[PDB]
Amino acid sequence: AKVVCVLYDDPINGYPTSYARDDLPRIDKYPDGQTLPTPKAIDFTPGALLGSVSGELGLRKYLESQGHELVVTSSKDGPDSELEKHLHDAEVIISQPFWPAYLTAERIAKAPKLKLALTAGIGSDHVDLQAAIDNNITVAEVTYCNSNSVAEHVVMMVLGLVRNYIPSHDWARNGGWNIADCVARSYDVEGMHVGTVAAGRIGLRVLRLLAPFDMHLHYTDRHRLPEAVEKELNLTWHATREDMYGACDVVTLNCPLHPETEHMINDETLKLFKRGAYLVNTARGKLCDRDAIVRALESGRLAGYAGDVWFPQPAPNDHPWRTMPHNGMTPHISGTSLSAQTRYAAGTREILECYFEGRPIRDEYLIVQGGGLAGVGAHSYSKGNATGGSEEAAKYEKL
Amino acid sequence: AKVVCVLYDDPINGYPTSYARDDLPRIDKYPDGQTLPTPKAIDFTPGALLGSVSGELGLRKYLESQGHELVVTSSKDGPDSELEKHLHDAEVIISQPFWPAYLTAERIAKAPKLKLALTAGIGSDHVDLQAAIDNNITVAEVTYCNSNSVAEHVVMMVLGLVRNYIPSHDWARNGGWNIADCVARSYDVEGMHVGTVAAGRIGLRVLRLLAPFDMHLHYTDRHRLPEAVEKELNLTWHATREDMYGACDVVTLNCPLHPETEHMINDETLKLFKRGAYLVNTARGKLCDRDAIVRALESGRLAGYAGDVWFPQPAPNDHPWRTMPHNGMTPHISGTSLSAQTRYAAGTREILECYFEGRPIRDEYLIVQGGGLAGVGAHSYSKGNATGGSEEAAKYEKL
Ligand SMILES: NC(=O)c1ccc[n+]([C@@H]2O[C@H](COP(=O)([O-])OP(=O)(O)OC[C@H]3O[C@@H](n4cnc5c(N)ncnc54)[C@H](O)[C@@H]3O)[C@@H](O)[C@H]2O)c1
Numbered sequence: 001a002k003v004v005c006v007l008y009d010d011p012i013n014g015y016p017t018s019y020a021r022d023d024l025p026r027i028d029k030y031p032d033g034q035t036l037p038t039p040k041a042i043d044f045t046p047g048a049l050l051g052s053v054s055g056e057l058g059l060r061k062y063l064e065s066q067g068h069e070l071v072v073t074s075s076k077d078g079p080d081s082e083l084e085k086h087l088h089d090a091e092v093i094i095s096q097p098f099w100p101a102y103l104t105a106e107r108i109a110k111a112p113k114l115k116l117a118l119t120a121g122i123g124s125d126h127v128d129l130q131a132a133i134d135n136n137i138t139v140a141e142v143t144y145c146n147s148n149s150v151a152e153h154v155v156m157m158v159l160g161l162v163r164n165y166i167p168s169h170d171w172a173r174n175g176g177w178n179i180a181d182c183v184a185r186s187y188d189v190e191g192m193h194v195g196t197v198a199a200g201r202i203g204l205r206v207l208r209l210l211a212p213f214d215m216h217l218h219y220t221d222r223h224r225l226p227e228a229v230e231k232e233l234n235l236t237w238h239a240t241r242e243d244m245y246g247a248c249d250v251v252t253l254n255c256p257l258h259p260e261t262e263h264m265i266n267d268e269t270l271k272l273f274k275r276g277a278y279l280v281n282t283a284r285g286k287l288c289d290r291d292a293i294v295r296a297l298e299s300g301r302l303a304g305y306a307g308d309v310w311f312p313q314p315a316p317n318d319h320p321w322r323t324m325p326h327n328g329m330t331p332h333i334s335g336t337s338l339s340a341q342t343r344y345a346a347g348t349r350e351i352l353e354c355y356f357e358g359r360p361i362r363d364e365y366l367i368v369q370g371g372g373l374a375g376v377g378a379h380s381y382s383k384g385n386a387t388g389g390s391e392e393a394a395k396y397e398k399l
Numbered sequence: 400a401k402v403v404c405v406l407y408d409d410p411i412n413g414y415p416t417s418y419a420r421d422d423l424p425r426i427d428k429y430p431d432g433q434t435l436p437t438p439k440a441i442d443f444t445p446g447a448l449l450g451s452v453s454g455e456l457g458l459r460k461y462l463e464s465q466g467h468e469l470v471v472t473s474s475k476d477g478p479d480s481e482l483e484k485h486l487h488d489a490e491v492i493i494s495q496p497f498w499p500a501y502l503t504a505e506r507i508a509k510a511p512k513l514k515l516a517l518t519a520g521i522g523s524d525h526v527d528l529q530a531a532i533d534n535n536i537t538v539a540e541v542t543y544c545n546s547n548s549v550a551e552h553v554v555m556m557v558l559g560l561v562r563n564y565i566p567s568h569d570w571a572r573n574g575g576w577n578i579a580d581c582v583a584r585s586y587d588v589e590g591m592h593v594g595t596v597a598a599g600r601i602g603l604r605v606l607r608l609l610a611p612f613d614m615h616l617h618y619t620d621r622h623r624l625p626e627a628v629e630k631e632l633n634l635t636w637h638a639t640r641e642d643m644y645g646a647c648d649v650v651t652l653n654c655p656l657h658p659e660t661e662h663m664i665n666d667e668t669l670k671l672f673k674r675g676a677y678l679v680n681t682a683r684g685k686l687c688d689r690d691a692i693v694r695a696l697e698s699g700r701l702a703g704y705a706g707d708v709w710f711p712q713p714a715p716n717d718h719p720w721r722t723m724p725h726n727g728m729t730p731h732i733s734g735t736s737l738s739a740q741t742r743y744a745a746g747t748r749e750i751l752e753c754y755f756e757g758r759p760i761r762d763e764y765l766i767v768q769g770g771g772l773a774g775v776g777a778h779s780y781s782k783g784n785a786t787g788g789s790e791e792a793a794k795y796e797k798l
């Protein structure tokens with residue numbers, strides 16, 4: 001069969017064979033008891049760069065030795081991409097949320113042999129889920145692979161914004177000292193109220209990381225947590241997201257992207273935040289109206305915004321979040337730290353081995369199967385399409 | 400009496416009357432049960448900028464109404480400073496570690512009316528403690544005022560270094576995407592070993608903040624913690640600092656500066672770190688040999704270094720830590736967030752009220768009194784002088 005694997009470019013100065021450290025830490029299992037991926041073998045070295053074109057997710061030997069054709073490319077956006085040329089006979093398409101191959105209805109209709117859309121990471125909203133249901137395609141992703149990695153990045157960005165790290169580093173590297181300039185907007189998080197929209201694998205982990213900072217913890221979710229968990233963390237529950245915003249100094253977004261959540265942060269809902277609130281979004285870029293965020297930072301409704309996720313991806317070179325006031329943005333990186341890459345490469349292989357050998361894919365990895373939501377898809381998503389507007393990624397140019 | 404108060408400059412665009420938020424969080428007491436400062440009154444608005452020249456620590460009304468003269472200046476370094484002109488008849492000298500008036504032996508000898516050297520913050524190593532003992536001067540500081548503020552900054556910098564935040568933000572603001580360039584040095588902290596040199600008010604708080612990240616926790620201290628605390632956090636104890644370094648992926652320094660600790664990190668002791676270790680130092684700059692740190696980052700012995708403290712302060716414009724590889728420096732700011740400033744301004748007033756009214760200063764605020772170490776000074780310090788080399792601060796120029 002043909003397998004198309006869309007991956008991001010190698011580093012600008014080439015694909016490295018040496019790294020800052022020699023080993024990854026040992027991790028035995030995930031916090032809810034889920035086991036780490038269980039492929040029969042791996043053909044890579046843990047800790048290596050796996051998610052760029054020359055890393056190939058360590059999949060070449062495995063696939064070729066079975067007689068399959070692996071096509072690896074970074075060319076994904078626009079009507080003349082390499083992806084577009086391989087659609088006609090692709091049986092499996094693999095991509096990562098960090099550099100996503102958008103599988104719109106029109107593209108799925110061009111793909112008559114397509115059976116499996118595989119997300120190397122977590123969040124399958126770059127595939128039109130309504131269309132995958134309609135055309136009987138399986139959508140799978142590597143549940144839990146980087147949920148803890150992302151919760152680290154959330155805490156990092158909450159602290160970065162509130163304490164005013166980025167402009168303070170610039171004063172240091174530019175030869176200055178300038179204490180009052182640094183601290184005119186610098187606070188401690190101690191005693192602040194923080195709320196998360198959703199307490200899933202990431203959102204619950206974020207609450208647990210922030211408890212010892214002596215922040216007052218708030219949440220809302222489609223699924224309420226057990227009473228024992230609420231009581232252990234002294235959680236305040238809010239029945240709707242809109243009830244929660246007014247109560248929080250800091251809000252973090254941790255839900256998936258689907259029609260119930262698309263553009264949930266907008267000009268109208270921002271009016272409900274406290275003046276000078278901080279907003280962190282490592283979930284998906286399209287939860288926020290792009291221009292509403294910029295306006296709120298210009299007026300002081302938000303004291304700061306930070307996240308690693310944008311819409312579309314890659315973001316155009318002049319996307320306004322790059323240069324808006326008081327921002328702590330990164331490109332989409334938290335879920336593709338080197339540590340997470342080894343877990344999701346092993347996971348991608350586990351799913352392919354099941355698929356090719358005719359064994360069932362883990363229920364926790366399933367999003368869509370057999371014309372409906374399935375596995376974690378049924379818990380966390382709703383039916384619909386979130387890919388509208390994704391053609392705009394074609395405008396990005398390297399450098 | 401004459402009170403000399405050395406404070407840092409106002410912000411470059413002037414002293415503000417508006418802030419990003421309207422209120423500070425309420426804090427009731429410190430974690431070990433110590434009460435917050437108890438001055439009889441305050442003449443400032445909590446949340447305002449207090450530690451610059453125009454903030455005056457909110458002390459003018461109080462002092463003048465008692466018939467005392469308050470001299471406020473930022474001019475402190477060099478033989479022609481304002482500080483130098485006021486030494487001859489100063490009874491009280493106040494300064495903050497962020498912008499410290501170095502009270503060397505020669506300066507103390509010029510100050511025949513001097514009775515009280517007051518540290519607005521924590522860490523009184525910019526005063527020659529041997530000379531204050533010899534000349535019967537009281538040295539006091541505002542214990543606990545910003546210990547929790549600093550422990551937030553430590554976690555922020557540990558995450559920033561390991562996850563590679565700063566260079567990733569630059570790719571975002573410069574129009575790029577460049578995932579592989581960002582994550583070629585990006586790891587999770589999950590499962591790493593972290594050790595602190597000292598577990599005092601800051602160091603113990605840092606261990607408590609990092610426990611839920613599932614890091615393996617290590618420490619050493621002059622004073623060992625109770626067995627119950629070691630057992631609650633699953634702490635690994637090391638009897639010397641040198642035994643601890645080899646066991647750690649990440650090392651954080653949280654001890655005071657005195658002869659036992661001066662230049663403890665140097666070319667010889669860096670050889671004991673794991674290759675690719677991360678070092679964070681928000682304690683004092685002079686714990687580290689300046690050029691040894693630079694060498695270790697050039698060879699890859701250290702994968703990164705970050706901190707807010709330098710020697711001398713302000714650091715010269717070409718101090719090498721500003722531009723060394725893989726650094727996450729800020730100027731000295733963690734202990735002077737707006738939240739901490741209100742606690743230490745109230746504290747500075749509490750001590751002055753005791754002093755002027757002939758009441759005893761809290762034992763927990765004392766460093767030196769009556770020709771010996773006293774209060775927290777006796778617990779945490781040794782006799783000696785750490786001010787050698789501080790004349791070099793005169794080389795700093797604004798901008
Ligand atoms: N690198 C990254 O920045 C990155 C990495 C992983 C995940 N993510 C994003 O984070 C999302 C969550 O990840 P996870 O591992 O926590 O997944 P999860 O499935 O365990 O958690 C999702 C949670 O959102 C809740 N939810 C669904 N719809 C909701 C709605 N209408 N309102 C409130 N809550 C709702 C679900 O009940 C669930 O608790 C992913 O779907 C992905 O989009 C981003």
Ligand SMILES: NC(=O)c1ccc[n+]([C@@H]2O[C@H](COP(=O)([O-])OP(=O)(O)OC[C@H]3O[C@@H](n4cnc5c(N)ncnc54)[C@H](O)[C@@H]3O)[C@@H](O)[C@H]2O)c1
Pocket residue numbers: 521522523543545546549596597598599600601602619620621622653654655656659660681682683707708731732733734735775778779780
């Ligand atoms: N803004 C800042 O970056 C900032 C703010 C506050 C404090 N600090 C620095 O941090 C230091 C500690 O602050 P704290 O509030 O934790 O003080 P603390 O007195 O409560 O803790 C100091 C700890 O260091 C230990 N110690 C003393 N000598 C030691 C040695 N030889 N080896 C190992 N441990 C030793 C003591 O036993 C004590 O546990 C201060 O003295 C100051 O220099 C910096």
